[PDB]
Ligand SMILES: Cc1cc2nc3c(=O)[nH]c(=O)nc-3n(C[C@H](O)[C@H](O)[C@H](O)COP(=O)(O)OP(=O)(O)OC[C@H]3O[C@@H](n4cnc5c(N)ncnc54)[C@H](O)[C@@H]3O)c2cc1C
Ligand SMILES: Cc1cc2nc3c(=O)[nH]c(=O)nc-3n(C[C@H](O)[C@H](O)[C@H](O)COP(=O)(O)OP(=O)(O)OC[C@H]3O[C@@H](n4cnc5c(N)ncnc54)[C@H](O)[C@@H]3O)c2cc1C
């Protein structure tokens with residue numbers, strides 16, 4: 001049997017699979033290479049891996065995991081997860097292959113939803129980013145833009161971005177910004193454009209200029225976009241996990257949900273962005289809850 | 300110096316890593332007294348599973364040295380005192396003195412062991428403390444669980460049982476409760492309550508356990524339940540207030556009652572965790588530090 005089916009081979013699923021593999025549990029690990037950070041050149045902030053390529057990380061971790069004879073890997077798109085009348089969960093893939101598991105750990109991460117700006121996806125990962133703690137250093141002291149539609153995000157995002165560069169233009173892309181926020185930014189020599197963006201310029205995802213609807217053109221080298229995130233799958237929904245009084249689907253600090261034998265690790269947990277090292281840690285944590293839960297019922 | 304980081308374990312390393320990328324001025328201290336230095340390998344840290352403790356520490360420093368705003372000092376930190384300014388004064392063993400706006404403590408934890416002769420020679424080699432870290436390498440072996448306190452024995456037994464079923468519990472002269480004792484009898488796990496006289500086996504590799512009465516048993520290794528303590532009194536020199544969780548921490552980012560004082564690594568939960576978990580608590584701590592600075596500087 002499968003003790004735990006781990007859906008997702010990012011830092012979360014991988015580190016969860018590593019600990020569970022070392023704990024002699026039968027693990028089915030699933031990945032389909034739709035991880036959101038594959039659109040970026042490098043990755044930083046993961047100690048001892050500061051500067052590694054996102055596909056190299058994936059590969060090194062995937063191989064450590066496969067040292068352990070009980071962890072089995074499937075490069076397959078999981079499309080359905082269903083609690084049977086037998087208690088087991090049935091994992092089904094794109095190629096109609098079926099897997100039965102006593103436990104499921106969802107570590108599928110999330111996906112970016114972008115501001116209604118044309119051509120934005122080409123720039124995302126080369127010259128436009130979403131986390132300054134991750135990609136600020138490489139952009140430091142350059143003429144930057146912040147694209148932020150929702151107001152309450154803009155102010156915080158700006159103050160943070162200002163750590164890496166004091167040369168900022170905020171662009172709301174067609175949304176109002178309180179006189180409050182406008183005056184505070186402008187008091188820092190930071191201008192604000194409330195016009196909708198019509199165009200980005202610069203070959204191959206590398207920003208040069210931004211053209212607004214009015215016709216105005218400024219000269220930015222890159223910067224930061226605030227996306228909204230969604231889950232690419234509807235697995236939490238399929239399995240009936242309840243949303244909690246804290247806005248999340250998780251019930252303790254170990255990835256346990258409202259549904260017995262369903263667990264979460266990584267960005268699927270908080271439904272907001274973190275980092276590789278945090279996700280890995282949450283994988284380690286879920287592994288501890290899963291092994292603990294199995295131990296309790298079997299001993 | 301925006302933040303003095305005390306401790307270059309995975310916590311301090313990852314904290315300094317993020318702060319060096321946040322263009323903050325960092326002083327990072329470490330006196331090479333990490334508890335895990337007695338073990339020969341580390342596991343469970345993704346991409347780094349199997350690495351020597353030293354190699355891990357080396358690679359990290361080399362990585363944090365990449366960022367000009369961060370400078371590393373291999374001194375022992377003796378005193379951390381506040382000042383009339385609101386800053387913090389940091390004094391080392393060689394009496395050198397350091398000033399810094401904010402303080403991050405990531406000095407990990409130390410272990411106290413049960414009163415058994417020479418027990419420290421086997422720890423790291425054939426005696427261990429966490430089944431998640433070292434169970435794999437010990438699977439299906441003749442193991443002993445040394446646990447003086449009732450309240451910890453059962454948990455440690457159920458857990459270690461994942462890796463081997465050939466177990467012996469040794470309470471080292473301490474009483475085990477009737478209820479717990481019957482729970483173990485059912486799973487065929489023998490319990491010796493007699494005092495342990497000597498541990499035998501050369502070069503830190505356990506062979507035999509001899510009890511007070513004369514009984515010698517064959518065992519190849521196993522687990523001890525240590526009490527944990529803080530090596531320094533820094534938290535206490537800085538007057539952080541103990542929350543009702545049993546922790547000097549007010550949130551998930553290492554913040555405390557004492558403004559400008561942050562915590563990461565094993566010093567946070569004041570209980571064992573892992574390389575990868577501490578490391579991420581460094582990250583979280585960094586974020587919090589930069590977020591509180593940005594708030595005040597804007
Ligand atoms: C442009 C960019 C740059 C970044 N840079 C950094 C950085 O420098 N440092 C840093 O620490 N973080 C960075 N991040 C964020 C980092 O990538 C994430 O925080 C981290 O990957 C989250 O870990 P995770 O394991 O939760 O999710 P992921 O790593 O996203 O893993 C999710 C996995 O689930 C799999 N999956 C999803 N659905 C299915 C399905 N139906 N079937 C099978 N498999 C499925 C995907 O293949 C993916 O592998 C960056 C992100 C972006 C977008
Ligand atoms: C035998 C053993 C085996 C283990 N195996 C594993 C394993 O395989 N995988 C795993 O994930 N975890 C393992 N661990 C646990 C792991 O080592 C710890 O969980 C982790 O290192 C603690 O993180 P930390 O950074 O908070 O503390 P540490 O890494 O211990 O960092 C504390 C640092 O603070 C420094 N320090 C403290 N006070 C001062 C001072 N006054 N001045 C200067 N420097 C100071 C010390 O030099 C030390 O380097 C093991 C632990 C032990 C004991």
Ligand SMILES: [Mg+2]
Pocket residue numbers: 040041042043134135138
């Ligand atoms: Mg990058």
